[model samples]
Target: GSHMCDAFVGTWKLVSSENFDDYMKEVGVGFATRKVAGMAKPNMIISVNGDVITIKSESTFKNTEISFILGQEFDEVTADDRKVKSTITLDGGVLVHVQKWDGKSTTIKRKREDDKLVVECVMKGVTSTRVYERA
Candidate 1:
């Protein structure tokens, strides 16, 4: 039987990114890092193995990946180099990720609609939305 996240198991190409720079600034991201982040037309691959799921994003600057299980908290070094406790949960078929560090927190939600994957990242009242298509 397929898992609840099976629908997200595949390769996807970056299509649309919105307000990313604004959100990155709120995270205290480095000047050059934020500049470089917008330059990649990255590939996002989601894979499942046994009880774990991996979400990998490839970029010209650097690669980002999170190996996680539902509701399990783990350490994650974020793109901005913040070491955070990260966990993912499912809500109404949406994949929700919460990352916390030093009293700061953020939420990321990934949902599938109209055959496209839409990712929403929220931090300190700032939000960014990025869309991807299957590749």
Candidate 2:
């Protein structure tokens, strides 16, 4: 399988953010909760080995991790502490992870461009994208 640079296998700082509202909406976060979401800075850590990946996102308020195999279906628990188990695939050279929990699903795509790893979360009717540059 094709792989990314080993540089992506470490922790990265969340320098800035955008379209957080849209992301919250996509993830089914309510309006009142949106205000708090934008105020916090989150750090993303990615570890890749062969065809397996483990990602851990850390925030001032919460921290979560998801581990899965490429091109396989697995059970997962989301960052928001939501219980989800889903399949992940590669689309457009991006890792497209689909979480199936509670009869609903969310899709998160990860890709590397230039010096950044972009993560986009789509679910609950909204899509939120975040960029992480090497730290």
Candidate 3:
């Protein structure tokens, strides 16, 4: 078995965010929602049970969780409250996540770098980097 699941089995606190505000614009997030989402420092919790893995995000403004098997697609309600089809898979040790709603799609890649959890989000040529420390 891959160590990917164990690598993410902990709580993470956001430490820095770059260009996330503009990425929100590309995602068509509402103005007020973007304002809040950009300002809030979120926490992520990762846990695994047998073949099912759960990843949850908690923030002052919203909380969202997705539980699934790797490579399986599921209906997801995102932190921004968007109803989208989401899939999570792994490329070596990196977590590759994809979401699609309406005609738009977003890709999020998460990997562990040193002692930090680095998340990169992309949408319509816009990119954001969010880094988190184990909490």
Q: Which candidate is the best by lDDT?
A: 3
Model 3 residue 64 CA deviation in Å:
1.2
lDDT value for model 2: 0.74
lDDT of each: 0.91, 0.74, 0.92
Q: What's the count of clashing pairs in each model shown?
A: 0, 2, 0
Rate residue 22 of model 1 by lDDT.
Answer: 91
lDDT of 3 by residue, 1-135 (tens): 655569888999999999999999999899999998898999999999888999999999888888999999999988888999989999888999999999889999999999999999999899999999999
lDDT of 2 by residue, 42-128 (tens): 888888877678888888756877777777787766545567778877766787888787677778787887888888877665667
Scored by lDDT, model 1 comes in at: 0.91
How far out, in Å, is residue 11 in model 1? 0.4
Per-prediction TM-score, please? 0.95, 0.78, 0.95
Q: How far out, in Å, is residue 45 in model 2?
A: 1.3
Residue 122 C-alpha lDDT in model 1: 97
Task: TM-score for candidate 1, please give it.
Answer: 0.95
At residue 65, candidate 3 shows an lDDT of 83
Better of 2 and 3 by lDDT: 3
- Per-residue lDDT of model 1, residues 1-135, tens digit only: 878888999999989999999999887787898999877788999999988999998978778998988989999997678999998999999999999898988899999989999999999889999999999
Stretches > 4 Å off in candidate 2? 5-7, 30-33
